[PDB]
Amino acid sequence: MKTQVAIIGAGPSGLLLGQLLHKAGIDNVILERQTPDYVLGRIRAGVLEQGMVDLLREAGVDRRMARDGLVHEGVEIAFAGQRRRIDLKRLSGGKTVTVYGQTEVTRDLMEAREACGATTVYQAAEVRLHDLQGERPYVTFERDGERLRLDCDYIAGCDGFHGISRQSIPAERLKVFERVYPFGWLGLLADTPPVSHELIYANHPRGFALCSQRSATRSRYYVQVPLSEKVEDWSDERFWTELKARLPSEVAEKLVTGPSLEKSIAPLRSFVVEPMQHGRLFLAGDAAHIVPPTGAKGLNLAASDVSTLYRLLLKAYREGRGELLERYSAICLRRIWKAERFSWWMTSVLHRFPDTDAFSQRIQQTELEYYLGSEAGLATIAENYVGLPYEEIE
Amino acid sequence: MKTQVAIIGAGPSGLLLGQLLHKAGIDNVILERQTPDYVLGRIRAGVLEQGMVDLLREAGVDRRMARDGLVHEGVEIAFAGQRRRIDLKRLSGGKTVTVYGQTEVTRDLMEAREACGATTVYQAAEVRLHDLQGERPYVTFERDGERLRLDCDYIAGCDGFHGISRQSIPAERLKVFERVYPFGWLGLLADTPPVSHELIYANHPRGFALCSQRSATRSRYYVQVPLSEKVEDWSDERFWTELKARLPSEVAEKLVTGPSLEKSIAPLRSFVVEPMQHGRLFLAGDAAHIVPPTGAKGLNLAASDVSTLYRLLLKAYREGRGELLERYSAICLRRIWKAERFSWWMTSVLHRFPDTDAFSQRIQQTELEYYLGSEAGLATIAENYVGLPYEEIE
Ligand SMILES: Cc1cc2nc3c(=O)[nH]c(=O)nc-3n(C[C@H](O)[C@H](O)[C@H](O)COP(=O)(O)OP(=O)(O)OC[C@H]3O[C@@H](n4cnc5c(N)ncnc54)[C@H](O)[C@@H]3O)c2cc1C
Ligand SMILES: Cc1cc2nc3c(=O)[nH]c(=O)nc-3n(C[C@H](O)[C@H](O)[C@H](O)COP(=O)(O)OP(=O)(O)OC[C@H]3O[C@@H](n4cnc5c(N)ncnc54)[C@H](O)[C@@H]3O)c2cc1C
């Protein structure tokens, strides 16, 4: 069994890369440990950058998104009982973000891939990567019993934080950078209408809160919770009481509560591995890095990783330019570190940290007051939020 | 012995306030523990904001400064071997900073005060403040032996961090905010020409370094040093070797070294007391707050404190509006906290901290890369550096 690009993981990353590759005639096979159904169960991302929206268009998978997506020209930040709006469009010079659930994005790429008839092996057990530094690497796996082999020229590891590809690069060749936050996010998806037509990030003495959405009849809310919490400890009622308690009154007031469709706890982390490739293995998305959700950069970085990998696989294949692939890591990390720094900054100014002395508290509040009151401060938030520009390559 | 405004401390603060008050006909007496000569021995500040320069003009003490001062339209930041210039003038929309030693400023106010013949008691021992909450407070002190009393209506505590005025407000009525940095600044004043016509702030793996100046034939350099160091452990030669080692080669190369005129170690601290007044006592400058030198805000905040106190003492005296003085603290802290936050940010991105993990290191470098590469990032540095605008009052 042979292919040109073996792809580990059928998440937004592998699917998006697989799709882009297919359009250029570069054969690829995707391997997924789970079922189409499990992958679709993950809620995750709601905010998409401009570059991601255009990338979705280039892969010809933007019909439903252009229809149901919601373009947002601003986002709000509330602290000390005062909402301050950031005009993304104005401040970024025309860019905006699009709210469209990751579940939907994944669902659209899954359909586009099935129609075009490209290979996709779900429930691919025991995926193992071999001969990474050879001229001819290969992947082995077990499809419901029998051990199958798949030869390829390149492997794109799009298997996420707990994937096998990063584990396959010799530990000694990687440099890991990581920060674990002492809190997590308790998320609740409801079939009620959102409290505001725009996202509201909230810094409150009780902890962080975020009012987001998926459509006009579906909401996604988040509250900061310590690591000790177990989701089973939060009835819907406790969550609503808590959310209402962290929001500005004129907001808590019009909030339409209702039963939860999903509730999960996501702990915050920052992680970067350098480099992002080894021999004929290239890491992408969550396989290579993790950003805390505060900045909404995760899925968005995956897109630029993929966008970069695709453009280089083209040069290498179509133009017979295989030496250019040695640049992937260099090119990606620049955007990764800026995105990481932004995500880190958002998290530090919006959440409540445990052993915080009076001076730090005061500094946190002044950071908000400053960046939120200055035209230059607002612009740094905005350009980073809409997402910094992708790099050209070469 | 009576006066209208008793002033504790003949530093830039008390002298500047005393001068401004005198021009409006508001009598004041200044009390200084030291000799005119000791006060003149302190080197300290070299950078002045726009607002301070104009305030010096309003007090009619800007002749020598307009002559010898140096207006700087930019400052530089070097890191990872690359100088990046910040166009203060361009980015701030016309503002600049003026390099003029604090020794000179203090010397000019001392002369202006002696000519006009206003009272000034040097070597005022045992200054003690009484009846702070009464309608008629008073100061006691010992002039070379005899205990003298001085009645006044108001007391402006301009005695610095180790002054007596802040110690005189009941500890229970104050809220202190403080951060002590695990490093200090080793400064060296030389009668050699500066290495660059503009200040060069330097982040280097060995530690922070700063190339500043006082005139065209006098330089002031600083290097970061841990708290364990004793100044007697740094020969001039060691300092030059060290400075050269932390700078970019094309800079270390043209550096003209020479014998030190002064060498001192200044530890970094951040301190704010809230409120800044008690009864008929008003704190100003270093008596009320301390900022690490990184941002060059210290002397500059003193000026706005004084500028605010003066304008309110006028309303109260000339316009018989004494209830307005209850606003002093409110008005001052806003500017103090923004200035503190800026100073804190500068310090954190330019110095090397001890127990720093790989992720923080990387974040520090990306902060520089980002703010220094973005037009909006550069603007946040610039507007804060030239100094945020003073508030109107009322
Ligand atoms: C609360 C939350 C909110 C977020 N909000 C945002 C936001 O609004 N905007 C934003 O940009 N980002 C946000 N994200 C991040 C975003 O969801 C992720 O970065 C994104 O899901 C990563 O895409 P991925 O394809 O790289 O990996 P994944 O989504 O994890 O998918 C990887 C796939 O590979 C599969 N796989 C794993 N191991 C193997 C194996 N060993 N063999 C074969 N297959 C394997 C997995 O089953 C999975 O299907 C958020 C994340 C969370 C949790
Ligand atoms: C290395 C260094 C660099 C700096 N660089 C800058 C820079 O470029 N820009 C900037 O804006 N700031 C900078 N500063 C800060 C600036 O020097 C101070 O903020 C400023 O000196 C404070 O003015 P002040 O009058 O409030 O107090 P001080 O300068 O301390 O003077 C207070 C006076 O009151 C007197 N006094 C004290 N106790 C008593 C008493 N109990 N009775 C009577 N009199 C008393 C003292 O003797 C002293 O004369 C720097 C400081 C340092 C150390």
CATH of the domain at A145: 3.50.50.60
Q: With beta carbons less than 8 A apart as the criterion, state whether B132 and B139 touch.
A: no
Ligand at minimal distance from the CA of A222 is 1
Domain contains B298: yes
- Give the Å distance between the CA of B299 and the centre of ligand 2: 7
Could you tell me if A248 and A104 lie in one domain? no
Domain contains A304: yes
Cα B377 from Cα A11, distance rounded (Å): 35
Q: With beta carbons less than 8 A apart as the criterion, state whether A302 and A192 touch.
A: no
Domain range holding B244? 73-95+181-268+352-388
Cβ-based burial of A82 (10 A; exposed 0-12, middle 13-18, buried ≥19)? exposed
Cα A339 from Cα A333, distance rounded (Å): 9
Domain contains B368: yes
Q: Enter the DSSP assignment of B367.
A: H
List chain B residues with CB under 8 Å of A369: 337-338
Q: Ligand 2 pocket test: which of B44, B140, B142, B269 has the largest number of ligand atoms within 8 Å of its C-beta?
A: B44
Q: Report the phi/psi class of residue A94: left, alpha or beta, with left for phi > 0 and alpha for psi in -120 to 50.
A: left
Q: With beta carbons less than 8 A apart as the criterion, state whether B75 and B69 touch.
A: no
Q: Over the Cα atoms of chain B, what is R_g?
A: 21
Output the six-digit token pair for B356: 């720093």
Domain contains A109: yes
Long-range pairs for B66-71 at CB < 8 Å and ≥24 separation? B68/B100, B68/B104, B68/B215, B69/B98, B69/B99, B69/B100, B70/B98, B70/B99, B70/B100, B70/B213, B70/B215, B71/B96, B71/B97, B71/B98
Residue in the block written with tokens 């003085």: B325
Distances (CA, A) of B323 to A2, B24, B312: 86, 20, 10
Cβ-based burial of B264 (10 A; exposed 0-12, middle 13-18, buried ≥19)? middle
By C-alpha distance, which of B210, B189, B188, B218 is closest to B77? B210
Could you tell me if B24 and B126 lie in one domain? yes
By C-alpha distance, which of A32, A310, A8, A330 is closest to A156? A8
Backbone angles phi, psi at A294, to 5 degrees: -45, -45
Q: With beta carbons less than 8 A apart as the criterion, state whether B362 and A272 touch.
A: yes
Could you tell me if A202 and A173 lie in one domain? no
Q: With beta carbons less than 8 A apart as the criterion, state whether A183 and A351 touch.
A: yes
Q: With beta carbons less than 8 A apart as the criterion, state whether B18 and B128 touch.
A: no
Could you tell me if B241 and B328 lie in one domain? no
Counting atoms of ligand 1 from 1, which one is nearest the CA of A15?
Answer: 25
Q: Enter the DSSP assignment of B25.
A: T
Q: Give start and end residues of each alpha helix (H) in chain B.
A: 12-23, 36-41, 50-58, 63-68, 88-92, 102-115, 165-168, 236-246, 249-252, 298-318, 328-350, 358-373, 375-386
Distances (CA, A) of A358 to A181, B167, B175, B242, B272: 20, 21, 9, 36, 10
Cα B139 from Cα B129, distance rounded (Å): 5
Cα A169 from Cα A277, distance rounded (Å): 8
Domain contains B394: no
- Residue A392 has, within 13 A of its CA and on its CB side, a CA count of 1
Could you tell me if B33 and B85 lie in one domain? no
Breaks in chain A (C–N beyond 2.5 Å) sit after none
Backbone angles phi, psi at A85, to 5 degrees: -95, 140
Contacts of A228 (CB under 8 A, 6+ apart): none
Domain contains A158: yes
Q: Is the peptide bond before B259 cis (omega within 30 degrees of 0)?
A: no
DSSP string for residues in B231-281: GGG--HHHHHHHHHHHS-HHHHTT-----EEEEEEEEEEEEEEE-SEETTE
User: Is residue B325 classed as helix, strand or coil in its secondary structure?
Assistant: helix
Could you tell me if A302 and A331 lie in one domain? yes
Could you tell me if A142 and A245 lie in one domain? no
Q: With beta carbons less than 8 A apart as the criterion, state whether A390 and A51 touch.
A: yes
List chain B residues with CB under 8 Å of A176: 358
User: Is residue B4 classed as helix, strand or coil in its secondary structure?
Assistant: coil
Contacts of B119 (CB under 8 A, 6+ apart): B3, B28, B29, B30
B100 is catalytic: no
User: Identity (one letter) of the amino acid at A20?
Assistant: L
By C-alpha distance, which of A180, A270, A184 is closest to A231? A184
DSSP string for residues in B30-64: EE-SS-HHHHHH-----EE-HHHHHHHHHTT--HH
B201 is catalytic: yes
Could you tell me if A241 and A380 lie in one domain? yes
Output the six-digit token pair for B147: 């205990």
Could you tell me if A188 and A283 lie in one domain? no
Counting every residue, how long is chain B? 394
Could you tell me if B160 and B244 lie in one domain? no
User: Identity (one letter) of the amino acid at A284?
Assistant: A
Q: Report the phi/psi class of residue B300: left, alpha or beta, with left for phi > 0 and alpha for psi in -120 to 50.
A: alpha
Domain contains A393: no
Chain B interface with A: residues with Cβ < 8 Å: 175-179, 270, 272, 337-338, 340-341, 344, 357-360, 362-363, 366-367, 369-371, 374, 376-377, 379-380, 383
Angle formed by the axes of helices B358-373 and B375-386, to 10°?
Answer: 90
Cα B27 from Cα A189, distance rounded (Å): 69
Q: With beta carbons less than 8 A apart as the criterion, state whether B257 and B190 touch.
A: yes
Could you tell me if A212 and A168 lie in one domain? no
- Catalytic entry in A201, A310, A371, A390: A201
Cβ-based burial of B115 (10 A; exposed 0-12, middle 13-18, buried ≥19)? exposed
Q: What CATH number does residue B210 fall under?
A: 3.30.9.10
- Give the Å distance between the CA of A11 and the centre of ligand 1: 6
Output the six-digit token pair for B91: 């980015």
Cα A391 from Cα A388, distance rounded (Å): 9
Domain contains B393: no
Strand partners, B156: B7, B282
Distances (CA, A) of A107 to A40, A114, A228, A380, B181: 7, 11, 34, 34, 52
CB atoms inside a 10 Å sphere around CB B338: 19
CB atoms inside a 10 Å sphere around CB B37: 8
Q: Do B344 and A358 touch (CB under 8 A)?
A: no
CB atoms inside a 10 Å sphere around CB B262: 12
CB atoms inside a 10 Å sphere around CB A201: 20
By C-alpha distance, which of B151, B222, B137 is closest to B187? B222
- Give the Å distance between the CA of A204 and the centre of ligand 1: 29
- Give the Å distance between the CA of A194 and the centre of ligand 1: 25
Best of B174, B289, B337, B378 to mutate (most A CBs within 10 Å, chain A) = B337
Residue A157 parent element (H or E): strand A154-157
User: Is residue A35 classed as helix, strand or coil in its secondary structure?
Assistant: coil
Could you tell me if A233 and A321 lie in one domain? no
Instruction: Find, in chain B, the residue whose alpha carbon is nearest to that of A361.
Output: B177
Cα B325 from Cα B140, distance rounded (Å): 24
Cα B18 from Cα B169, distance rounded (Å): 22
Output the six-digit token pair for B84: 């990046």
Query: Is B167 labeled as ligand-binding?
Result: no
Instruction: Find, in chain A, the residue whose alpha carbon is nearest to that of B91.
Output: A376
Solved how? Answer: X-ray
Contacts of A327 (CB under 8 A, 6+ apart): A312, A393
- Catalytic entry in A95, A194, A293, A317: A293
Resolution stated for this PDB structure, in Å: 2.5
User: Is residue A60 classed as helix, strand or coil in its secondary structure?
Assistant: coil
Ligand at minimal distance from the CA of B222 is 2
- Catalytic entry in A23, A36, A72, A244: A72
Q: Domain tally for chain B?
A: 2
Best of B178, B273, B362, B364 to mutate (most A CBs within 10 Å, chain A) = B362
List chain A residues with CB under 8 Å of B337: 362, 366, 369
Strand partners, A190: A219, A260
B162 is catalytic: no
- Residue B169 has, within 13 A of its CA and on its CB side, a CA count of 24
Residue B176 parent element (H or E): strand B175-190
Residue A167 parent element (H or E): helix A165-168
Q: Residue-wise over B293-317: b if at least 16 C-beta within 10 A, else e?
A: bbbbbbbbbbbbbbbbbbbbbbbbb
Strand partners, A110: none
Cα A386 from Cα A101, distance rounded (Å): 17
Cα A93 from Cα A178, distance rounded (Å): 33
Q: Is B184 in the pocket of ligand 2 (CB under 6 A)?
A: no
Residue A335 parent element (H or E): helix A328-350
